[PDB]
């Protein structure tokens, strides 16, 4: 149809006279906390169902085919998870059995408190890398060597193989307990807005840098070299230079085997990902490559005849729960917070992906509480921080997963691989385990291809991606996230400090106002200069507003007034002996403002007062209701600054100006 | 007065098909790099005028209330400057001989370069300990430690003199020169936007604990309490509890002397404020309480007979300029960066606190080079850093003062006190001059009255004021402003993340759309609702914008889709076996107050459109004026079905679009 209206000019006062405002509701803090405190059995049952979602999806099971689906998904996910755990155990500097421990107990703890259906709780390469880094920083290698072995010249201060692993495991357990406590605190206190600051480019750059560091560490492990656990500033660059300098002390057989298995795994993964229409079930390349590696390494004595690197330290059993060593929280609080927030971000991302893929809901605070309880239970049984790997979750989702029972069955695989099975993997080379991690880095390595796409998009988002990726390499990985979130907040502040001000004008015989820098055939008011200023004025962009006004009016309210004062005294001395030509008004279209920051309303009133002395009216166009109600309490409407200065719409101000010019010459 | 604005409804594609755009100027620097100042002499004369802020106020002052007002004010702040030079020099581990030079030379170069009134350039208490910290670290206390003097058992390892303090002054002079060139090189690239981040409650909440810091720093000297030096965390608390713990060895004669003077000085001060219409020129009680204190001390021997504490160490005569050591600038460079930042922070914080009572807003670029070259001119003469004390800037502004000439005449008082008036203020009890700063300190102690005032105006800045106050007490004045600077910026990102979102509704027989939570007797279109987030959709408020929709529409687009397919599969098996949706048709997001968008916002906003599209409920938008519109189409928002037709220029066009469609 059409758009035509006719109404009087309600600027500020002609609107609030015949409009009865809605009185605010009574606070009544006592009755508010009393009424909010629920006591009926309905709320109790609701909070019990929410806190314990196990009683929700259990009674409505579909056992008929879900039994077979869950058993096959469980055996597959159990194999994949025990392989990923025995691989990531090297990233946390812990023995190979504690990876299987952290692949068994967290699943059982998440089965009774989780809210997802496809999330495979277990180890994670980035989290394991951060745990290993903080363990090396808190317990380096040169702090355990004991002089023994009747050395030639000095005391034989060889490696501390033995009690060193116990100290590392205790440190990892304390770290896991602290991370679980932090997650439970963040969950119970309903403080979940802290993880919203992890932007998509920020987390992308962080994952890219973490994958690069994981590649460096796994290359160090494959080459079988001995570094000095460089940590701190430029740790990755220093250890990479050391690797490049320590090439001579490598193992040719281990390097050849690692390169071969890397090529094979990458080729098989690419073939399975590309030609999916011919093979429905993904081929477990990890399982078959581990089997063939154990078979080849058992035929010939690869440990003695080839001097390879194997585990051969699997006791094939459990251990009683050990009390955590409390007291190391003050020196690892920041590291635990970083690990917890990155693990929660990755878990929420994986959950949202595999939930929008399967069309079900996943609660954030419930996942936080579940991961907290899982890490707390893991800290009592010598396990590290658990998360959900994108590669491990993909297997359970591709093989067909409906409920967490497949995860419970996935624990049975690790269960039988801990009690009796497990000692058969004795001659397995450590390079094979250190290779699948590199093969799983293809997902995060291909994330760099977004920079050419983000650069064509909003450039400020691309700068955050490059800055987060680079800064998370210089000053380590744990402190790199803190340097990324602060940089993102500073970039947000810069976008609200430097707005996009224009010369908004009206199309001929219209009422909508568009910018003048993007159109040609626009008419401007005779004398009046319209201005729009987004990014609401606060204490940091008030000088920007001053400069924008001075640029859009052509002059300055200070210099013109000083010139007028200088010309006035020349008149009073001449009688004793014997600029602002085009500018008529200023309509500020501050319609994109949210807050006002009274520190800035002071300068706004100062501007209004200064422009009044030079006989230049400064009006407003589209101020919001809440903004005006806030400015009223900030001392802005004095006996001279009435409400007639403000307006409701932009066209009403121009109409009032035209009417005043026509009725008053 | 009505007006006819009859115009067909214009969407985005319906407005660009008949109009024309303007070719955006890329403005490449390959040929436009010489457009600032090529040959025009007008731009060259402008930067020289701003470089020398002496040709602005000096050829413009009025001598009516200038001569007598600044002279009585200059001697007031000049006396305080002499006492600070005699006290802060001892804290910097250097001999107390150049303290008067730090108040004379920097003022001369700052009198011409620098436009910031009510500021007395000189030493600052918290910046003197930073200079003394790097001296004791990079220079041992005993350089030679000559073991001579025929002691009791072993050789008398007496501390070497003469050459020890000489290297201490040389090291301190090199640091001031290194800070000066670092302060000057910052003005090269013109980083003047850092001062814009200092809000009035930020500088107000900073110069209230510093007023408490300068109070406890002047309380230990007015009571003669030998306390240790404390810096870092809990610095103000540790010094306060030390005075209360070591209050025993307190000079009773000096206590009653300062207590009697602090009362009479503030009583006449408020008396002048009451009788300001009777006496035109304010009576300079500072020089009055000074001459009577030296009289009662010289005539009674308060030092050798009462132990009251006097200066008795006033130097005499200037010294020729000495060249510094350039080869030592490398070691001092690692520590001078921390001192140079905190020096400029306190320097401009005391300039903005007085910008609220007088319209004298200053610029950061000019003050960065003003204090920069002043410390350079302070260099080569074995002077101190070119900071500004909080006590001297209070005694100059409260007791008269019009321009910076009061600092120039104050240096003249220091110039005559070093060459000819050394023996005059010899028996000065160091109490009437150390407590006179507390009288003028009421101008900053009474600044806490804005907390109940700002609380009723805006709750956010009221918390910012009290946060910087309590944080500067614990973390000291060094980290107090730094932590408050990030906290002030944190309130900006929080107010933009959690806005006052409300559903809008039109007024009857009109096209004005306002919030329905603040009005009554409104109406809402049957099946069409309005939502105005009034905040940009960045990576932080992504889920907040989602929670704003599901809480306003009544239902949740996520839970109604899975239950729909669940019921669809439930009724599907019943056909083979044998056989809470709100009537709201669509929603129009009135996201017109958005100023910027990011990649996370345009991706999440696309998911919202695809989410409601599956529930047979359309989603429309509102005015995207110039930037938030072109950024969406650039980030890949329109692929096959989503087009610019769903947007609207005005909010009423969105309601009229859904009206005639049905």
């Amino acid at each position: 149809c059409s758009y035509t209206v006719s109404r009087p000019v309600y600027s500020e006062l002609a609107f609030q006279q015949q409009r009865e405002r809605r009185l605010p509701e009574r606070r009544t803090l006592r009755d508010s906390l009393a009424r909010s405190c629920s006591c009926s059995r309905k709320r109790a049952f609701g909070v019990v169902k929410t806190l314990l979602p196990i009683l929700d999806w259990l009674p409505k099971y579909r056992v008929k085919e879900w039994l077979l689906s869950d058993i096959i998904s469980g055996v597959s996910t159990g194999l994949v998870g025990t392989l990923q755990g025995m691989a990531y155990a090297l990233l946390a500097a812990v023995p190979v059995q504690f990876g299987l421990y952290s692949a068994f107990f967290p699943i059982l703890t998440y089965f009774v408190f989780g809210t997802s259906r496809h999330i495979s709780v277990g180890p994670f390469p980035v989290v394991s890398l951060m745990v290993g880094s903080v363990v090396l920083s808190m317990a380096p290698d040169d702090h355990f060597l004991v002089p023994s072995g009747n050395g030639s010249a000095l005391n034989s201060t060889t490696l501390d193989t033995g009690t060193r692993d116990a100290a590392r495991v205790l440190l990892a357990s304390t770290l896991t307990l602290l991370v679980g406590i932090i997650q439970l605190v963040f969950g119970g206190l309903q403080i979940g807005f802290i993880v919203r600051y992890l932007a998509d480019p920020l987390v992308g750059g962080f994952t890219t840098a973490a994958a690069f560091q994981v590649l460096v560490s796994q290359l160090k492990i494959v080459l079988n070299v001995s570094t000095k656990n460089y940590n701190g500033i430029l740790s990755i660059i220093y250890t990479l230079i050391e690797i490049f300098q320590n090439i001579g002390d490598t193992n040719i057989a281990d390097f050849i085997a690692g390169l071969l298995t890397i090529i094979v795994c990458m080729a098989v993964k690419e073939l399975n990902d590309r030609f999916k229409h011919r093979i429905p079930v993904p081929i477990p390349i990890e399982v078959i490559v581990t089997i063939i590696a154990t078979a080849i390494s058992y035929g010939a004595n690869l440990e003695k005849n080839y001097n390879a690197g194997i585990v051969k330290s699997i006791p094939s059993g459990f251990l009683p729960p050990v009390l955590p060593s409390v007291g190391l929280f003050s020196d690892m609080l920041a590291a635990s917070f970083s690990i917890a927030v990155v693990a929660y971000a990755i878990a929420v991302s994986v959950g949202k992906v595999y939930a929008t893929k399967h069309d079900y809901v996943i609660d954030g605070n419930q996942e936080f509480i579940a991961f907290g309880i899982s890490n707390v239970f893991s800290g009592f049984f010598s396990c590290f921080v658990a998360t959900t790997a994108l590669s491990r979750t993909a297997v359970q989702e591709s093989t067909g997963g409906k409920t967490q029972v497949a995860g419970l069955i996935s624990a049975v695989i690790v269960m039988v691989a801990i009690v009796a099975l497990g000692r058969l993997l004795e001659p397995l080379q450590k390079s094979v385990l250190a290779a699948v991690v590199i093969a799983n880095l293809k997902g995060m390595f291909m994330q760099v291809c977004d920079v050419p796409r983000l650069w064509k998009q909003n450039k400020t988002d691309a700068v955050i991606w490059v800055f987060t990726c680079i800064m998370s390499i210089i000053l380590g990985l744990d402190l790199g996230l803190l340097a990324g979130l602060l940089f993102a907040l500073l970039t947000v502040v810069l976008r609200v400090q430097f707005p996009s001000w224009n010369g908004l004008g009206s199309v001929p015989s219209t009422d909508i106002y568009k910018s003048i820098t993007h159109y040609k055939n626009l008419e401007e008011p005779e004398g009046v200069k319209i201005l729009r200023f987004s990014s609401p004025i606060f204490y940091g962009n008030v000088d920007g507003f001053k400069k924008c006004i001075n640029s859009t009016v052509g002059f300055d309210a200070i210099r013109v007034y000083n010139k007028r004062l200088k010309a006035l005294r020349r008149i009073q001395k001449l009688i004793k002996k014997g600029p602002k030509v085009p500018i008529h008004s200023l309509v500020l279209d501050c319609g994109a403002v949210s807050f006002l920051d009274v520190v800035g309303v002071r300068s706004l009133r100062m501007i209004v007062k200064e422009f009044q002395r030079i006989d230049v009216n400064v009006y407003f166009a589209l101020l919001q209701d809440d903004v005006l109600e806030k400015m009223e309490q900030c001392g802005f409407f004095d006996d001279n600054i009435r409400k007639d200065r403000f307006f409701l719409t932009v066209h009403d101000a121009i109409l009032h100006l035209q009417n005043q010019v026509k009725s008053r010459e």
Side-chain angles (χ1 to χ4, degrees), chain A residues 38-40 42 44-152:
Chain A
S38 300
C39 194
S40 60
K42 178 61 83 287
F45 179 81
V47 300
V48 166
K49 184 68 62 178
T50 301
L51 184 60
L52 288 78
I54 177 180
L55 300 180
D56 190 10
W57 56 269
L58 183 61
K60 56 167 175 290
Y61 216 85
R62 291 184 175 90
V63 190
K64 180 60 180 300
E65 69 286 346
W66 281 13
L67 221 178
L68 180 60
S69 180
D70 290 326
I71 193 73
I72 188 264
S73 299
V75 295
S76 181
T77 310
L79 294 180
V80 175
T82 187
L83 291 180
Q84 290 190 9
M86 70 184 305
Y88 296 153
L90 302 182
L91 286 177
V94 297
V96 87
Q97 56 167 158
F98 298 91
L100 279 71
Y101 292 155
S102 180
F104 177 73
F105 291 138
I107 299 186
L108 302 184
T109 315
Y110 186 84
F111 178 80
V112 291
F113 290 104
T115 182
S116 180
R117 296 179 177 90
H118 300 170
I119 286 183
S120 60
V121 44
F124 196 87
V126 177
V127 183
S128 300
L129 172 72
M130 296 186 64
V131 169
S133 180
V134 302
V135 164
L136 291 176
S137 66
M138 192 55 58
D141 193 12
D142 55 354
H143 196 272
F144 296 90
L145 75 176
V146 46
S148 294
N150 59 267
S152 60

Side-chain angles (χ1 to χ4, degrees), chain A residues 6 14 59 184 195 245 259 271 341 364 372 385 510-511 541 590 626:
Chain A
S6 297
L184 290 180
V195 307
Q245 292 180 0
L259 180 60
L271 182 62
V341 65
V385 183
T510 59
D511 60 330
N541 65 334
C590 300
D626 192 13

Side-chain angles (χ1 to χ4, degrees), chain A residues 172-182 324 329 375-376 378-380 383:
Chain A
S173 62
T174 55
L175 172 67
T176 313
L177 178 68
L178 186 53
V179 168
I181 292 180
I182 292 180
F329 300 152
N375 300 329
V376 165
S378 306
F380 296 153
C383 305

Side-chain angles (χ1 to χ4, degrees), chain A residues 386-573 575-610:
Chain A
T387 333
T388 161
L390 183 59
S391 61
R392 180 174 60 257
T393 308
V395 180
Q396 184 179 179
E397 186 271 346
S398 58
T399 55
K402 307 302 296 180
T403 56
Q404 293 291 153
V405 182
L408 176 62
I409 298 175
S410 174
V412 186
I413 299 300
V414 188
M415 177 63 180
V416 75
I418 289 179
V419 46
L421 192 60
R423 80 105 171 267
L424 190 142
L425 306 179
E426 184 269 348
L428 175 57
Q429 288 183 150
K430 300 177 59 180
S431 300
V432 182
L433 302 179
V436 295
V437 188
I438 299 180
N440 292 130
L441 294 179
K442 180 59 66 63
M444 291 182 293
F445 280 158
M446 294 295 101
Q447 297 182 1
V448 194
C449 300
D450 73 333
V451 184
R453 182 59 58 90
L454 294 182
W455 189 265
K456 301 180 60 180
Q457 299 181 358
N458 175 266
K459 301 180 180 300
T460 64
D461 303 329
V463 180
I464 299 180
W465 198 100
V466 180
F467 187 88
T468 305
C469 180
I470 292 182
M471 192 57 59
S472 46
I473 294 181
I474 300 180
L475 31 78
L477 186 64
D478 44 68
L479 257 298
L481 179 70
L482 182 60
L485 299 176
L486 294 180
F487 179 81
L489 296 181
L490 181 60
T491 310
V492 171
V493 173
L494 289 180
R495 287 193 291 260
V496 306
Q497 184 187 6
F498 299 90
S500 60
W501 56 271
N502 295 324
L504 273 283
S506 180
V507 224
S509 180
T510 59
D511 60 330
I512 177 62
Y513 290 83
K514 302 299 297 180
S515 176
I516 194 60
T517 61
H518 289 58
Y519 298 92
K520 181 182 301 300
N521 298 19
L522 296 186
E523 58 176 9
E524 58 180 0
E526 208 291 79
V528 185
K529 182 61 179 300
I530 311 178
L531 173 62
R532 185 171 180 91
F533 195 91
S534 300
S535 300
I537 299 94
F538 59 100
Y539 65 93
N541 65 334
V542 48
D543 300 330
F545 200 12
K546 276 287 300 180
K547 182 179 300 300
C548 172
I549 293 180
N550 298 9
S551 300
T552 191
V553 309
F555 60 89
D556 196 334
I558 299 299
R559 296 191 298 266
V560 172
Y561 188 68
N562 291 15
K563 293 301 179 180
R564 287 298 181 179
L565 292 184
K566 183 180 300 300
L568 180 60
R569 55 97 179 183
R570 293 296 300 181
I571 299 300
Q572 64 181 0
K573 66 180 300 180
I575 57 180
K576 185 180 60 60
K577 184 260 181 61
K580 49 175 178 173
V581 181
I583 296 299
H584 189 201
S585 298
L586 176 63
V587 180
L588 300 181
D589 191 6
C590 300
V593 298
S594 60
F595 51 88
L596 227 282
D597 189 16
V598 49
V599 198
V601 90
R602 296 180 179 179
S603 181
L604 289 182
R605 182 174 59 91
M606 180 60 60
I607 293 172
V608 173
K609 191 63 178 181
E610 289 176 0

